[PDB]
């Protein structure tokens, strides 16, 4: 009754639905806590990440850096494969993928540069060939430059700069953090206070309005205690903006319009600690002495409830939900609550290979100085136990185990982890994604299915900027691990393969293993 190709198409349709039923983040990070890790040696074929190459800082940048009179700073434009260095009032960009790069110098600025960022342009403003806007903040003003990052035959963007006549006086508030939205909105913050500013700009000059303006969205007044920002974070999928303060206060702002920004949540460390105390498992790794060192937004495509990850200096990952009071009038949330905690692993890095309760006391990630999360959960933590050498903890969801876990009530935040050692003197500065953002589906269910996209998009790669160079870290897929493991079985017995294969079956299941 039903011919071959139609029968096989039925199998495809049911297989597509099976891959798109991969558990969403909310489902395996339910209220509670977890310490589930399988640690892998960095030199193992089972390593979830590994360093593929490194790019030294050009010698000319070292000449300028050591010629610094007062202030210097480094940063990453990982989206286009560029890095930058500021020396006092001078800025230098370069393509770090190029073996002998030329330095793009920009020295028009009159005062010390305090922040630099590469953001999308405002639509309908610039010629289509302008791909980005370069924001340069000094102690006196903020400067906008047009950017065209067109790809070259070699695979590294060609960068040319355009003047704009767009600039505004800074004012009294320091600018150390610049972030941009998908639509080209530019937000500013710094180390003077917790105020958030926005830069507006338009093509036409008017007699009653300049081409470029600046406004303070915080509208402060009266008595104000000392407090400033540690970072700004954007989530376009929810039209939200987050700030982290030096007191570990998390503020949430909603973009109710193309020119509006409204503060809708303010959650201090005490509130986080109160939520934590109401959880079943309390821990000495999170107290009133603990600092939150970084935030990472979680987009709505990845999870409905969990909006935000917060990293403590003890290495705890705090996952916070946010909820609106109502269901209709984007809808702004009005509450934020600490729901789930991923506690640190226990295994420390070792030169020699060393040999079920919730582990809520590990110090392996203490102190955590910098932290980053990328969908579907790739986690980088800069652990600074010693003041000269950084250790990099890198982990990923155990996609294979999460996909096979049954029933749904048994789902936990299983992870594969590893330690990547940086040489003595390497101080990590920034980590950015070099490939396209990960997404296996368009909604939380199916979103995190790494297995499904092994052959549709290249493995994620991450540029780790240090004070000596840029290191490229690459995510390894099942097929990469399987191929590497088999490569070690080439010189062994019939039973040597069967043993290695059984490791894969016990983690990924038989079908996924045979498919690899």
């Amino acid at each position: 009754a039903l011919p071959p190709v139609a029968k096989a198409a039925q199998v495809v349709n049911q297989t597509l639905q099976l891959d798109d039923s991969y558990p969403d983040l909310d489902s395996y990070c339910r209220p509670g806590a977890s310490s589930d890790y399988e640690m892998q040696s960095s030199d193992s074929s089972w390593a979830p990440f590994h360093v593929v190459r490194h790019h030294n800082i050009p010698d000319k940048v070292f000449e300028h850096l050591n010629a610094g009179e007062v202030f210097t700073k480094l940063g990453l434009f990982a989206e286009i494969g560029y890095a930058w260095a500021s020396i006092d009032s001078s800025l230098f960009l370069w393509d770090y993928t190029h073996p002998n790069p030329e330095l793009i110098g920009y020295e028009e600025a009159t005062h010390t540069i305090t922040a630099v960022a590469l953001v999308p342009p405002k639509p309908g403003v610039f010629v289509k060939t302008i791909t980005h806007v370069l924001v340069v903040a000094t102690t006196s003003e903020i400067i906008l430059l047009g950017v065209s990052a067109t790809p070259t035959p070699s695979g590294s963007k060609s960068l040319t700069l355009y003047s704009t006549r767009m600039s505004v006086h800074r004012g009294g508030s320091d600018v150390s953090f610049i972030v941009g939205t998908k639509d080209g909105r530019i937000f500013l913050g710094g180390e003077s206070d917790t105020d958030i500013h926005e830069i507006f700009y338009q093509q036409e000059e008017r007699w009653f309005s300049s081409r470029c303006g600046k406004i303070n969205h915080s509208h402060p007044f009266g008595s104000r205690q000392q407090e400033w920002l540690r970072g700004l974070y954007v989530d376009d999928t929810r039209n939200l903006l987050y700030s982290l303060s030096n007191r570990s206060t998390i503020r949430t702002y909603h973009m109710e319009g193309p020119e509006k920004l409204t503060k809708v949540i303010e959650k201090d460390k005490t509130s986080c600690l109160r939520d934590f105390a109401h959880m079943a498992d309390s821990s000495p790794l999170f107290t009133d002495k603990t600092n939150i060192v970084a935030l990472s937004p979680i987009p709505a495509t990845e999870a409905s409830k969990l909006h935000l990850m917060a990293l403590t200096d003890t290495g705890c990952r705090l996952f916070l939900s946010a909820t609106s009071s109502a269901s209709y009038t984007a809808l702004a949330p009005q509450s934020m609550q600490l729901q789930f905690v991923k506690f640190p692993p226990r295994e420390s890095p070792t030169r020699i290979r060393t040999l079920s309760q919730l582990d809520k006391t590990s110090r392996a990630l203490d102190p955590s100085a910098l932290g980053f999360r990328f969908s579907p959960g790739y986690f980088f933590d800069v652990v600074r136990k010693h003041p000269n050498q950084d250790m990099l903890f890198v982990s990923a969801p155990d996609t294979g185990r999460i996909k096979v876990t049954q029933p749904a009530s048994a789902l936990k935040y299983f992870e594969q982890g590893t330690w990547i050692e940086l040489e003595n003197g390497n101080r990590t500065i920034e980590i950015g994604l070099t490939t396209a953002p990960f997404a296996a589906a368009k909604q939380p269910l199916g979103f995190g299915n790494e297995l499904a996209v092994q052959f549709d998009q290249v493995p994620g790669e991450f540029a780790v900027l240090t004070n000596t160079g840029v290191h490229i870290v690459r995510r390894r897929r099942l097929v990469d691990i399987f191929a590497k493991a088999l490569g070690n079985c080439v010189s062994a017995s019939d039973d040597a393969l069967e043993r290695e294969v059984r490791k894969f079956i016990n983690q990924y299941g038989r079908v996924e293993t045979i498919a690899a």
Binding site: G105, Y106, E107, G124, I130, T160, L161, S163, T164, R165
Partner: peptide, 14 residues
């Protein structure tokens, strides 16, 4: 080498 800054005329339309 100081980067050549092409003019605003090309940059913004129309």
């Amino acid at each position: 080498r100081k980067a050549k800054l092409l003019p605003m005329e090309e940059a913004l339309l129309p």
